[PDB]
Amino acid sequence: GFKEYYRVFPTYTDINSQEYRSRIETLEPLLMKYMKKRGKVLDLACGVGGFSFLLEDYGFEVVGVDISEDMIRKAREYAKSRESNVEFIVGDARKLSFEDKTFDYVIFIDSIVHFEPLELNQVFKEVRRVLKPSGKFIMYFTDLRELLPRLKEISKVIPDQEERTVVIEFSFRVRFNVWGKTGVELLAKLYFTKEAEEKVGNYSYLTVYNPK
Amino acid sequence: GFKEYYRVFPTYTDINSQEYRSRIETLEPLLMKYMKKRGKVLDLACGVGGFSFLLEDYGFEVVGVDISEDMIRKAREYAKSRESNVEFIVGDARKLSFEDKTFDYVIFIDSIVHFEPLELNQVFKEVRRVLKPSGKFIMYFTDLRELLPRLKEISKVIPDQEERTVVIEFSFRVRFNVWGKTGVELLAKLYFTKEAEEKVGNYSYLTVYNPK
Ligand SMILES: C[S@@+](CC[C@H](N)C(=O)[O-])C[C@H]1O[C@@H](n2cnc3c(N)ncnc32)[C@H](O)[C@@H]1O
Numbered sequence: 001g002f003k004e005y006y007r008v009f010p011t012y013t014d015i016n017s018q019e020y021r022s023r024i025e026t027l028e029p030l031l032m033k034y035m036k037k038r039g040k041v042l043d044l045a046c047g048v049g050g051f052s053f054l055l056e057d058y059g060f061e062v063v064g065v066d067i068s069e070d071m072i073r074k075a076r077e078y079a080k081s082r083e084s085n086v087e088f089i090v091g092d093a094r095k096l097s098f099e100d101k102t103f104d105y106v107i108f109i110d111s112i113v114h115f116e117p118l119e120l121n122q123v124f125k126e127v128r129r130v131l132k133p134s135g136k137f138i139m140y141f142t143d144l145r146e147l148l149p150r151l152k153e154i155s156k157v158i159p160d161q162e163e164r165t166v167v168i169e170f171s172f173r174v175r176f177n178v179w180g181k182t183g184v185e186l187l188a189k190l191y192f193t194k195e196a197e198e199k200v201g202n203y204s205y206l207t208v209y210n211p212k
Numbered sequence: 213g214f215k216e217y218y219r220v221f222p223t224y225t226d227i228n229s230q231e232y233r234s235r236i237e238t239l240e241p242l243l244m245k246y247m248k249k250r251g252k253v254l255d256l257a258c259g260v261g262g263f264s265f266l267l268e269d270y271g272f273e274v275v276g277v278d279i280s281e282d283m284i285r286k287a288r289e290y291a292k293s294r295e296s297n298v299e300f301i302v303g304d305a306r307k308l309s310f311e312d313k314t315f316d317y318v319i320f321i322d323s324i325v326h327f328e329p330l331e332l333n334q335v336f337k338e339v340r341r342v343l344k345p346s347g348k349f350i351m352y353f354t355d356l357r358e359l360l361p362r363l364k365e366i367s368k369v370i371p372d373q374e375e376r377t378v379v380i381e382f383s384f385r386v387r388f389n390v391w392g393k394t395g396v397e398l399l400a401k402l403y404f405t406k407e408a409e410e411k412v413g414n415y416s417y418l419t420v421y422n423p424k
């Protein structure tokens with residue numbers, strides 16, 4: 001994803017839009033089904049902080065991290081207007097500065113399109129490291145490899161599996177890293193054992209992982 | 213720059229890395245602001261061809277040239293996987309084999325650290341020659357002379373302005389030719405008149421030149 005893509009759509013940047021709320025209310029019940037015990041949570045690639053505020057209201061100590069200065073800037077204003085104590089930090093999910101075993105939870109939502117294989121490998125490694133052995137890694141992603149076929153329902157869809165990426169034209173174009181449930185889980189198997197898994201929609205998944 | 217430096221960092225060798233994409237998306241809008249009319253483009257010192265594919269998708273006839281056999285080899289594989297018609301050739305920017313007035317555009321991005329004064333002089337001369345009088349020379353460079361002071365934020369930085377070079381240690385060391393906006397433009401004034409100039413970041417510049 002990129003600058004224009006996010007400026008144009010509210011789904012990941014406008015916490016009060018119907019698009020964003022829809023995402024929250026869909027995941028909310030699933031997140032509570034596996035986050036009964038409160039603790040320290042890390043919102044990796046938090047965007048504008050929507051899921052952070054949600055967890056903070058459920059009695060969680062939240063820390064939000066994102067690589068975009070713009071995402072973080074908006075996050076803070078939202079935290080200000082909502083009088084939130086969630087701390088937002090501009091950081092790289094591929095290399096976090098937190099100490100080892102710092103979190104009880106680490107949530108990673110709708111963000112894999114931003115990582116190629118070797119980068120997602122680094123993120124998983126970092127997640128396992130900053131997670132307490134008793135902690136939980138919870139991620140939600142879309143099998144865009146399976147969705148690719150009938151994705152157009154957007155003017156064009158130019159794939160390239162010889163690279164695992166795809167260009168979608170809406171004008172402007174965006175190139176996404178394409179992931180399939182089998183590819184995500186393979187890399188996950190190097191660092192975690194799966195606690196649970198929920199199928200969302202036609203091709204989305206909420207997975208609960210425990211660090212090794 | 214050199215072999216290890218490029219093998220270690222993805223910025224100029226991994227077209228799908230976040231580092232490389234960041235560079236593309238930052239320059240993309242600026243390149244279109246001065247490349248409204250499509251035509252024949254020469255990507256001088258193209259590296260792995262990232263900016264070539266970008267222009268090719270915008271409807272440009274692209275030719276990529278680089279002195280490294282390795283850069284060119286990877287470029288071709290990327291072109292294959294992306295099913296691109298961009299032709300990559302292993303050549304020397306200091307002495308191109310193209311006929312005079314062959315291109316409408318010649319882009320030169322993040323590559324001056326590789327040229328000492330007399331070499332960059334030869335490149336500019338060659339660029340003017342292969343460029344159509346109505347063509348445009350577009351280069352992006354970093355004033356590493358101004359950046360030198362606060363570059364460390366890398367273990368060491370050993371300059372040597374009595375030579376216009378600097379050694380940066382990350383292990384391994386790399387020696388870069390150091391250029392300042394004033395030095396680059398001086399040599400440019402011998403062959404071109406400037407059409408436009410955009411300041412990028414704290415000390416980087418995108419310059420548009422017209423041949424004399
Ligand atoms: C779909 S968006 C927002 C996702 C957010 N978790 C949500 O559900 O609202 C994906 C975010 O990933 C972030 N991102 C991309 N690469 C990153 C990296 N290396 N480290 C941290 N965040 C990154 C972007 O800045 C972008 O805000």
Ligand SMILES: C[S@@+](CC[C@H](N)C(=O)[O-])C[C@H]1O[C@@H](n2cnc3c(N)ncnc32)[C@H](O)[C@@H]1O
Pocket residue numbers: 224256257258259260261262263277278279280283303304305306320321322323326
């Ligand atoms: C930072 S790198 C890649 C730059 C590329 N334009 C990009 O932005 O992705 C600089 C490139 O300059 C090339 N180079 C160095 N000397 C050269 C010469 N005399 N002729 C052509 N390319 C040269 C290298 O092989 C190296 O790939």
